[PDB]
């Protein structure tokens, strides 16, 4: 009943657009590995664009004024917040469904997570165009926890590589098992390829 | 009076113009006739293909 979307390889606003409408239709969404979101346009371009946003502050009392979140998760949240009617009750309710993470923490680090191919960089950009990793961007504008988020993700990838190896090992045995058994599953296996699987 | 649309309501068309009946009796028959004759061409073409 819940989207989990690996924000890696996606485009910041392009993903946010799609997430907003999901969120407005009552879909609970989770967006994970937000540092891996990447924004079209060469790096420097986007840094300035952020740095400008930093300059925007309520002169008389900055403490009130537009809160510039550094973490890539909160950045991505900010851009999704910009596509909902978030002053309404229904808008605020909508955001409460969305759940964003720098990196990929423990509920979702053992969940299969989708990819919006309509927000994906490999598709939506020309290959000769330039872009920025929202991590780097976040890092240079003051995000504290890049390295921590990297050191925790190397653990995760090592932990996962193990799971995949065991998964592969079952798949392989299952391929062997069928071959071991294929005269006493033969007139089942035949019927599952008259109606068109197994081919 | 309610305006029944002649072009949908056969009998209203006939009320306003009775020659419609015939015009539409023709052009059912005419079209059937020709539809039959197309099948007959198609059967002869299949027979010519078989030969």
């Amino acid at each position: 009943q819940v989207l989990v979307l690996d924000g890696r390889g996606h485009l910041l606003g392009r993903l946010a657009a799609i997430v907003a409408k999901q969120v407005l239709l009552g879909r609970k969404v989770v967006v994970v590995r937000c540092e891996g979101i990447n924004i079209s346009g060469n790096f420097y371009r986007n840094k300035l664009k952020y740095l400008a946003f930093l300059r925007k502050r309520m002169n008389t009392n900055p403490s009130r004024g537009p809160y510039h979140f550094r973490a890539p998760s909160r950045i991505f949240w900010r851009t999704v917040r910009g596509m909902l009617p978030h002053k309404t009750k229904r808008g605020q309710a909508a955001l409460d469904r969305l759940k964003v993470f720098d990196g990929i923490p423990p509920p979702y680090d053992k969940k299969k997570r989708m990819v919006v191919p309509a927000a994906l960089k490999v598709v939506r950009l020309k290959p000769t165009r330039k872009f920025a990793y929202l991590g780097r961007l976040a890092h240079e504008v003051g995000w504290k926890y890049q390295a921590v988020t990297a050191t925790l993700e190397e653990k995760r990838k090592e932990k996962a590589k193990i799971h995949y190896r065991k998964k592969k090992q079952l798949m392989r045995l299952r391929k062997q098992a069928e071959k071991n058994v294929e005269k006493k599953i033969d007139r089942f296996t035949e019927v599952l390829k008259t109606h068109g699987f197994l081919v | 009076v309610l305006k029944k649309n002649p072009l949908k309501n056969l009998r209203i068309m006939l009320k306003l113009n009775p020659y419609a009946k015939t015009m539409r009796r023709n052009t059912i028959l005419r079209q059937a006739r020709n539809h039959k004759l197309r099948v007959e061409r198609a059967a002869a073409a299949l027979a010519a293909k078989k030969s």
């Binding site: - | 009076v1 305006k3 002649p6 072009l7 068309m13 306003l16």
Partner: protein, 56 residues
């Protein structure tokens, strides 16, 4: 010109307009041509005695 679209109607157009939306002016009351008794009553002094005559 820039207030109208116009041109040369088909036969079918004259039929479809007259049958689907044919309304007489009969004592200055827009009245739908439900029967030829209406057309005749008004235009029968010209030899026009039915919807068909009108169309012609």
């Amino acid at each position: 010109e820039p207030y109208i679209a116009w041109g040369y109607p088909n036969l079918k157009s004259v039929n479809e307009l007259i049958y689907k939306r044919g309304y007489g002016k009969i004592n200055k009351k827009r009245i739908a041509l439900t029967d030829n008794a209406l057309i005749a009553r008004s235009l029968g002094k010209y030899g026009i005695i039915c919807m068909e005559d009108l169309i012609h």
